[PDB]
Amino acid sequence: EESDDDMGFGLFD
Numbered sequence: 001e002e003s004d005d006d007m008g009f010g011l012f013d
Contacts, residue, residue: 001008
C-alpha cells in the first residue's frame with residue numbers, strides 16, 4: 001500500500 005500518488009502503485013494512472 002502506497003496511495004502517495006493515487007493507489008498502492010508508483011505514480012500510476
